[model samples]
Target: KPVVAIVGRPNVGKSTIFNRIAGERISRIYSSAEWLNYDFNLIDTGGPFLAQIRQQAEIAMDEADVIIFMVNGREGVTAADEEVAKILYRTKKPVVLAVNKLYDFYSLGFGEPYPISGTHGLGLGDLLDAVAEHFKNIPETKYNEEVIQFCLIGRPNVGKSSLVNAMLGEERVIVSNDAVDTSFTYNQQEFVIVDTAGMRKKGKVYETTEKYSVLRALKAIDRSEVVAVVLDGEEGIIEQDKRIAGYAHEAGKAVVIVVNKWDAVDKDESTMKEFEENIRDHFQFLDYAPILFMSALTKKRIHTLMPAIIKASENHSLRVQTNVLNDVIMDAVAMNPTPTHNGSRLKIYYATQVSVKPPSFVVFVNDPELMHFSYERFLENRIRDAFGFEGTPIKIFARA
Candidate 1:
């Protein structure tokens, strides 16, 4: 799914614009009624910050796959609009010009401006139609039941390549510039070991910028079912290591913490425990990922790799019965009780799995706002306790 960022200057009916667009999507894009089976996250920038509009729009443009530029339709165009357009014209990303309350349409000669009246709901369909066109180019990320695909991710020279070499062994090896996979049998089911191109960057962003390199790493994480996050046991965890680790976790993919170059570090019995504790405390978000301390240089403990990948990938797509999910929810409520919000305690009706490959669920409730973060985490912890959704983020929505 691509992120659609709606940005404009102040007082351009941005919120109204977002509400209408989201309304249209709910009735279509991500809806069961529409033929398009897709999902997208809408980010309402509400225009960039004043005084630093240029700098802010530059940053926003980096995150947005499609930028919806909003302007006052009745005003035609203003100094602020022109200023923003000047910044947008320099960007190579797709831009959708949307003029609010303006009968006339315009862009910075980039494309035709969508004529839309936020109040009257005019030309919204055409605006959204333009937005949907961008989604078609973004390849859908999904996992089937066939095989478990895992990628090795790490900082530069952190033994990502060495780990791949160790996995294939010297018996029969294959090489390619693209992804290379090795077939192996695990627990009677065949597993495909895939190498990630996350650390393959040779100081090139593929374009004239550095953002594309980060996006390439993100793409690798998204494509694989399981991510083997390689860590340098010799160098220990650094700031960049944590960031690369987060790319997989945030994407809701199965994660396996691989501490590589174990041979490089001299260790006693407590050495492993100390290292694991440091990792657990530092990378708290990755507690679900099972740690494998291995030496790609020596192939020590390398055999455990595929089994862990398979285990995490299997659980990533695992579904629980509705009865089982509700029972777990009820049990958690009875055990510790639900939290109160502004004097009213939350009421959860039921829960069910909506989709998988990083399983998502909708927990119907009386009110969505009342389900605070702590309590939501509590529910999430309970669900994980009942069903170990290891190495993947479980998306639970609070829906009214």
Candidate 2:
């Protein structure tokens, strides 16, 4: 999807314009918006430092497919407006000049400003019509269907940003202990990676106030085919790490555990094993996930990271043959018959893969009630062992 960024002086009603275009209190931050049947990600450049708006505008110009240069029509142009115009002037990308309160905006030099009333909702239709004109011949999807989309998820200061830069082999994202959720493509096998803001615990007041970050994280996971759960190797497993990892597993997305900051750890042959053991013990739900020991800072073993993600994405979409699947299920049943519940034994009719992307399955049975959780687990284990689903989670449902 193309990105559209709103940039101007801070009080130019950037948020007001953003909320109006976004049409909800929910999508206020850097969020998704649609107009004139064209879907694009919307970025609102509102920051604490007025001086930083210039830099933000430049970043937006570089990253966004279309730039909306919003200005205050009531106040006309100021020196700060000219400074912003200078930055947008250099960008070759399409710019939609917008005057918040119209025709005098010609002095800004982008040509033909679309007058808009963010507060009263005027001229937005015409503004969007102009924005949609640039999207002609641009495919909604930036990459082919085979592209592996993934995100880096973790708590604050866990080197998610560093890992993303290392994976892309460039400093695309500014290395920050704080954060920004960024997206970029890399390699021959087109991969889209989202570097999300590190999540805090849900009950914390900070997260309650800054819930947009939390929502962004959830949305990122939902959009991604694979999720890389980053952990601070120096700090080891914390309660917050498990909570963050659980979200990906619960969401049914393919997951890979990344033990980052490996350079900071004092490692022996046993050190890696011990770390793996600790992770296995804590994140039992993520047993299917592959773990990698890599340092984003030093780029040690970072090359191994992408392949792991690729493998995970592949398995997440794996579809098994019906005959082969039934054979495995029958063999599992023959080896150890389903235990009796209330003097009645569970009977298996057959199994078939119902869908891909976490690979769900449905099994015909004599009675669904007789399918105990342990038996369900046993069947899942057999399927995994047979198919080598190393980095994906599969689902099973019993139906009569």
lDDT tens per residue, model 1, 180-216: 3455544446555553334544545444554665566
For candidate 1, the per-residue lDDT at 146 reads: 64
**Candidate 2 weakest lDDT stretch, 10 residues:** 171-180
Give all TM-scores, in the order shown. 0.60, 0.59
Name the top TM-score candidate.
1
Q: Give lDDT for model 2.
A: 0.76
Q: Tens digit of lDDT per residue, candidate 2, span 7-67? A: 8877887878777566322333354555435566676554445469767887776567788
Flag clash pairs in model 1: 8-47, 73-102
All models, RMSD in angstroms: 15.9, 18.4
lDDT against true structure, model 1: 0.72
For each predicted model, how many residue pairs clash, with residues at least 3 apart or on different chains? 2, 0
Clashing pairs in 2: none
